[PDB]
Design a protein around this nucleic acid. Structure first.
Lengths: 351, 339, 42
DNA sequence: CCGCCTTAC
DNA sequence: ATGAAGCCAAGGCGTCCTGTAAGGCGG
């Protein structure tokens, strides 16, 4: 099992959150940011402690009070603006139906059989609802919803005949799984995702647009660059800009973009089927929690994706008999499928 | 202790303070400044004298009388203006509850337990009162209230039902702490900040507006730009109505609200809350890690305060002051890591 | 401590008398002498 | 599981 | 079309520019 080359193309393909300012005078402009140099104070534990306690007074009471200047990219809502319009697109398809790579006719026919048996025995409703709940509740804005008054989602589906399906003040109206379930369009959009996953050459496009009402001069939190950086210390540049934003040029002027992979990471935050399960995890191989640096589904628990996929031939002879229990095994099938929906380096053996 | 990756996010979030000129017509224009050049005397000690000694040899009576020109940004109130109006927003959140990133399951559960025990034993009334007290007395204006006739502050909070909260002339009326606990709305807005620090996803937004009554074309003092390698005193700016305006900083307005720290070794006046309780006037650090009253000496004794906060009862000069300081730093802080 | 004074003076000058305001310190060949410091009123 | 390993405009 | 567009002097100092993670390979 696990051939020396097995891979998968992701089914969910989102890309971007372009921000726009709207003035009462209803016209849109790209949201702009400026590089701002600011004067902090010497606050790092390293500057007043060597190992593991006090240094000899090189860090004296005066030397710890010299203001250290830094530089950050600063984005906020301009004064006299009505709200922020956040534009974003998703396209759901069926790449999980076939492995991208080769080298095992057995594993290839096993995985396509498992997808088909899963589909038939327990429908796409669970994963579809989980992936659409966080697209229609502003999970993909990441932190811009926090300390906001109100935000409204409007998504233009395709292929679709009717009107743009809309979600009003989400903080209050749409809290629970039920609240999303009892508006008249929820069924149709869950069904066109189920169509997209179930059918071959399936496609469900969602052009999403979020209205976001922030307080006066409120700060915007876009995504940040990685930039592996080092030349020397004295001195490449006294500045060395901390907190650089990921940006694109809209209408000839630069604007922050809130990632593309970051947006994708927001939609796939559905995994609450791990040994303990307090909060949902980013669907991954080792169920890693980015903050609070640990791995639930460590490959010693035997609940990681490479342990679970090696019991696939098992799940074939459990999806055949009657009837699959609501306990862990349905969750294992869900987690396996959630991983086939995103991943594609199911190879280890070195790679 | 100090587990190499321990961060906290903000629990108080201020913004830029946009200035406006109000005319007797009751129309508003963005305040504007101009970079004017001026002539001063040769007044530097290191121009008439060398390294701590005597006159150089060439700084003669004629050479010291040549006027040196400089360039400064100049912001005054335009003539015939009624008053100045300053507007910004604050957000109080429960993000001190648990750390942003911790990297350690033990130090996390310790700090979560400590915040819980603090909340239960000592109410948020003290910190909430201290933070609100210098949003309603206009400390965020810094120097614009000095040499001013009158300044009035109006809060529009959220979530709210009722009419806006008002503080009239803040020199005669609202001097002391008991002046704030008066007529109507004080207790109702100190509560909702305690709720904002108590409840998970607990949020209290305030939008503050102030009116400055200054003398005839009086000097306005915004926040200045650091940017170094001519113009001394460059002002921080934004664009309102497609014209440049001074702003009085985002980080400076957070520094003003967080001048609550008068628990440092003895006490004189409140400092801006930090790890090594730095003072700006005299360039010394109070709460220097030698005194054992800095943040990393107090944080590494979390279990000691967990032991004391369990049973009755805390001595209200040392432990409660240290716990106030710890929470005050958690409301602000990030990053509390080591090696 | 604080003391604010609003000072107003009234100058009675002869007919078409010259007023002497502040002069601008200039950047600096073209001709120009006596550039005045100004503000915007009404 | 353990140690070896460099240079920057 | 007729002619010219004057000069003189200077350009301050003090202080600082954060920290965490994140190997291949042969043995």
């Amino acid at each position: 099992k696990l051939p020396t080359n097995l891979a998968y193309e992701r089914s969910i393909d989102p890309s971007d959150v372009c921000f726009f300012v709207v003035w009462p005078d209803d016209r849109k402009t790209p949201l702009t940011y400026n590089s701002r140099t600011l004067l902090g104070q010497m606050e790092a534990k390293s500057l007043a402690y060597d190992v593991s306690g006090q240094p000899i007074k090189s860090a004296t009471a005066e030397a710890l009070a010299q203001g250290n200047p830094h530089q950050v990219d600063f984005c906020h809502v301009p004064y006299g603006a009505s709200h922020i319009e956040c534009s974003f697109s998703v396209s759901f398809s069926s790449e999980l139906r076939q492995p991208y790579k080769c080298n095992s006719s057995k594993v290839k026919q096993t995985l396509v059989q498992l997808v088909e048996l899963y589909e038939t025995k327990i429908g796409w409703t669970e994963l579809a609802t989980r992936y659409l709940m966080n697209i229609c509740n502003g999970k993909w804005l990441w932190k811009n919803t926090r300390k906001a008054y109100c935000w409204n989602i409007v998504l233009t589906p395709w292929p679709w005949n009717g009107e743009k399906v809309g979600f009003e003040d989400i903080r209050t109206n749409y809290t629970s799984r039920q609240d999303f379930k009892n508006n008249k369009n929820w069924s149709a959009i869950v069904e066109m995702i189920k169509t997209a996953f179930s059918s071959t050459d399936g496609l469900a496009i969602f052009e999403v647009r979020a209205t976001l009402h922030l307080p006066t001069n409120a700060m915007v939190r876009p995504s940040q660059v990685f930039t592996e950086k080092e030349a020397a210390a004295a001195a490449a540049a006294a500045t060395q800009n901390s907190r650089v934003f990921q940006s694109t040029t809209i209408d000839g002027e630069r604007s922050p973009i809130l990632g593309a992979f970051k947006t994708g990471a927001a939609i796939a935050t559905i995994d609450d089927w791990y040994p303990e399960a307090t909060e949902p995890l980013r669907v991954g191989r080792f169920g890693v929690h980015r903050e609070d640096v640990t791995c639930y589904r460590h490959p010693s628990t035997g609940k990681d994706f490479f342990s679970i996929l090696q019991q696939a031939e098992h799940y074939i002879e459990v999806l055949s008999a009657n009837k699959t229990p609501a306990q862990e095994t349905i969750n294992d099938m869900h987690f396996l499928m959630a991983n086939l929906i995103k991943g594609g380096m199911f190879q280890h053996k070195g790679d």
